[PDB]
Design a protein around this ligand. Structure first.
Ligand code: ANP
Ligand code: MG
Length: 223
């Protein structure tokens, strides 16, 4: 049991695909060994979480998990639960001499404007010791006080070519034999989503044979 979604997750910023503008800017922050609070904006599955993790790794080295946490801001128990979690993580010093800790907050734009103000307090309460990376689908859905407190990064849909080239790399690494039409079927099914595509590729490969379009629809009927 191995999940290729994780085995083939970007380990460094250069390994994120289809977001070159954002990556160049982000790499300059690692060069300077510091980030401001960050707002990542774009369609689901474009790699916002992946680039946050790749940034943490570049910033902190192999012990990055010690100083990085992920949580969903739209927790069904309300903003005060999320805010409590943030307090707990924040109140110990960074581990291993890292300059700060990173909190990735997913789906921050599903917060009401009230919750967002609440969350903006907590964010300010910890600005020296922690850095926040907020994820959202639309900038316009994040309150102005948060927008101006952050460097903004707009993620774009990843092009078919970029997905194709990456899936091929993964096939090469795992010794998967896939036909041309199999690869086209896999891209079709992806819907632009790398997680869906890689999951399907792993299931198709587990069969043990040449992967074609029929194997793709078979995997996908059993989703
Ligand atoms: N832009 C990208 N470049 C390379 N791999 C990606 C990209 N986006 C997603 N992936 C892969 O898809 C899987 C999950 O991506 P990840 O960004 O962690 O979550 P996500 O929910 O798909 N993205 P997002 O909705 O933007 O937070 C991992 O295998 C990544 O390797
Ligand atoms: Mg997502």
């Amino acid at each position: 049991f191995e999940i290729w979604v994780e085995k083939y997750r970007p380990r460094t910023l250069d390994e994120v695909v289809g977001q070159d503008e954002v990556i160049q800017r982000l790499k300059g922050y690692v060069e300077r060994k510091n980030i401001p609070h960050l707002l990542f904006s774009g369609p689901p599955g474009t790699g916002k979480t992946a680039t946050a993790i790749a940034l943490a790794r570049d910033l902190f080295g192999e012990n990055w998990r010690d100083n990085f946490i992920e949580m969903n801001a739209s927790d069904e128990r309300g903003i005060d639960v999320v805010r409590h979690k943030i307090k707990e993580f924040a109140r110990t010093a960074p581990i291993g001499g890292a300059p700060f800790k990173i909190i990735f907050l997913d789906e921050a734009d599903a917060l009401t404007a009230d919750a967002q103000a609440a969350l903006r307090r907590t964010m300010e309460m910890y600005s020296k010791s922690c850095r926040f990376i907020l994820s959202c689908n639309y900038v316009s859905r994040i309150i102005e006080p948060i927008q101006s407190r952050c460097a903004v990064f707009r993620f774009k849909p990843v092009p078919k070519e970029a997905m194709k080239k990456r899936l091929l790399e993964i096939c090469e690494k795992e010794g998967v034999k896939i036909t041309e039409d199999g690869l086209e079927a896999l891209i079709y099914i992806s819907g632009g989503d790398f997680r869906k595509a890689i999951n399907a590729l792993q299931g198709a490969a587990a069969i043990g044979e040449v992967v074609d379009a029929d194997t793709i629809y078979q995997i996908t009927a059993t989703a």
